[PDB]
Amino acid sequence: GPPGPPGPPGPPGPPGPPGPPGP
Amino acid sequence: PPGPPGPPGPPGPPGPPGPPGPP
Amino acid sequence: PPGPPGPPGPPGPPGPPGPPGPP
Known part of the structure; x- marks a missing residue:
C-alpha cells in the first residue's frame, strides 16, 4: 500500500x- | 498489507507572548 | 491500502517577547 498522509x-x-524593564 | x-x-504554531518585564 | x-x-517555536515593564 502507499504511505499514509x-x-x-x-x-x-x-x-x-x-519583556525588558519599564522606562 | x-x-x-x-x-x-x-510544526505547531508559535507560542503565546511572554510576560511583561519588571518595572 | x-x-x-x-x-x-x-512543537512550535517560542512566542514573541513580552512588552516592557511598568515605569
Whole structure:
C-alpha cells in the first residue's frame, strides 16, 4: 500500500521570554 | 498489507507572548 | 491500502517577547 498522509500539526510552542524593564 | 506510516506533521504554531518585564 | 497518518509535528517555536515593564 502507499504511505499514509502527514501527521497533524504539533503543539504550540512555549511562551516567549519576558519583556525588558519599564522606562 | 497497509503502506507505511506517513511523515510527521507540520510544526505547531508559535507560542503565546511572554510576560511583561519588571518595572 | 494506505498506511496510517504520521505522528504529530514538532512543537512550535517560542512566542514573541513580552512588552516592557511598568515605569
